[PDB]
C-alpha cells in the first residue's frame, strides 16, 4: 500500500480483536486464498474467522484434548491439527466435519503441516519422531526417528521435496521426503532448545527460533547462520515466527512480554512492536496478499488481534 514496499518502518495498527476461545490460543493461520483465519486452542476447538473483517465464521471440533497446531492445505480446502489426544485430524473446512484421524504418535502431537501438493502431512510429536502421512489414505508413510527430545516444528519447502524439523534437543534437521533420509543438521555450540523453524518462501533459508530469546536466519545449503534477530522475550514457549513480504520484508514474531515484534530482515533492527495483548503472544501470522498480521495470546488473555498496515 501507500508506504514503500521497502519503507523505513511500517505502521501496523489494531483493527480487530476476536474472542470466542474459552482457553489459551495456540496458533493462527491465514488460508492460502487469504479469505479466512483459523485458530486452534487449548479449549479443544478450531475457529474460522473472516480475514478482513474479523467476523466469526464457524467452530470445527472433535479433538479429545488440546490442539497445539493447525495448518491449511494449498487449495484452502483442508485443515490438519495436532492434538494432545495423541492424534492429528484432517478437516473439511467447508463442512466442518472430520475426514480422517491420523493415529500413530505415542505422545502429544505438537506441530503439523501439509506439503504444497497437499497429498502429504508432516507431523511433529512429543515422542520425538517426525511422521509423514498420506492425506487420502489417512495412513502413515514414514516414522523418522528425527530427534531425542520433543519435536517443536515441521515444514515442507516450495515443492515438498524437503522437510525441516526442530526440537528441544537443540537441533534443526532437513529430511528428504522421498527417502526419509536425514540430509543436514543445523547445530550450535550451546544447543539451546529449538522452539521453531520454517523454510523461507524461496526455499534457500530456514528461519529458526531458540529458547534464548533469539531468532535465526540460516542458509541451509551452506549450513551457515546469516542473521540473528533479538530484543524480545522467548525462553518458555514455542512462538511461531513469520516472513512478511506483501509490504516491506520483515521477520515477525510474538513474544513473552505480550508484544508482537517486527524486524527488518536485512538490518535485523526492530522496526515495530505491536502493543495490545495482555499475555504472551504465542502465535502470529502474516496475510498472504495484504499487510495483515494475526496474533494470538495465552489463557491469561485468550484473544486474537488483527493489525493492518500501509
Amino acid at each position: 500500500g501507500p508506504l514503500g514496499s521497502t519503507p523505513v518502518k511500517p505502521n501496523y495498527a489494531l483493527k480487530f480483536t476476536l474472542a470466542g476461545h474459552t482457553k489459551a490460543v495456540s496458533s493462527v493461520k491465514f488460508s492460502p486464498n487469504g479469505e479466512w483465519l483459523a485458530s486452534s486452542s487449548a479449549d479443544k476447538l478450531i475457529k474460522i474467522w473472516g480475514a478482513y473483517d474479523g467476523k466469526f465464521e464457524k467452530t470445527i471440533s472433535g479433538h479429545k484434548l488440546g490442539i497445539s497446531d493447525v495448518a491449511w492445505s494449498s487449495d484452502s480446502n483442508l485443515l490438519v491439527s495436532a492434538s494432545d489426544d495423541k492424534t492429528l485430524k484432517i478437516w473439511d473446512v467447508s463442512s466442518g466435519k472430520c475426514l480422517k484421524t491420523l493415529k500413530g504418535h505415542s505422545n502429544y502431537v505438537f506441530c503439523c503441516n501439509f506439503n504444497p501438493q497437499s497429498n502429504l502431512i508432516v507431523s511433529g510429536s512429543f515422542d520425538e519422531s517426525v511422521r509423514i502421512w498420506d492425506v487420502k489414505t489417512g495412513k502413515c508413510l514414514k516414522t523418522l526417528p528425527a530427534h531425542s527430545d520433543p519435536v517443536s516444528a515441521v515444514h515442507f519447502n516450495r515443492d515438498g521435496s524437503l522437510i525441516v524439523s526442530s526440537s528441544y534437543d537443540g537441533l534443526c534437521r532437513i529430511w528428504d521426503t522421498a527417502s526419509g533420509q536425514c540430509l543436514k543438521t543445523l547445530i550450535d555450540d550451546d544447543n539451546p532448545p529449538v522452539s521453531f523453524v520454517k523454510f523461507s518462501p524461496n526455499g534457500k533459508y530456514i528461519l529458526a527460533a531458540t529458547l534464548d530469546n533469539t531468532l535465526k536466519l540460516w542458509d541451509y545449503s551452506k549450513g551457515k547462520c546469516l542473521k540473528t534477530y533479538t530484543g524480545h522475550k522467548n525462553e518458555k514457549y514455542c512462538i511461531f515466527a513469520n516472513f512478511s513480504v506483501t509490504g516491506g520484508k520483515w521477520i515477525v514474531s510474538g513474544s513473552e512480554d505480550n508484544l508482537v515484534y517486527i524486524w527488518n530482515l536485512q538490518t535485523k533492527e526492530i522496526v515495530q512492536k505491536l502493543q495490545g495483548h495482555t499475555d504472551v503472544v504465542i502465535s502470529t501470522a502474516c496475510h498472504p496478499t495484504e499487510n495483515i498480521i494475526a496474533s494470538a495470546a495465552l489463557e491469561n488473555d485468550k484473544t486474537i488481534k488483527l493489525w493492518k498496515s500501509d
Binding site: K23, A24, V25, S26, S27, S41, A42, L65, G66, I67, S68, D69, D84, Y108, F110, K236, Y237, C238, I282, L298, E299
Partner: peptide, 5 residues
C-alpha cells in the same frame, strides 16, 4: 499443549 511450559 503448546500453551503449557
Amino acid at each position: 499443549a503448546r500453551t503449557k511450559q
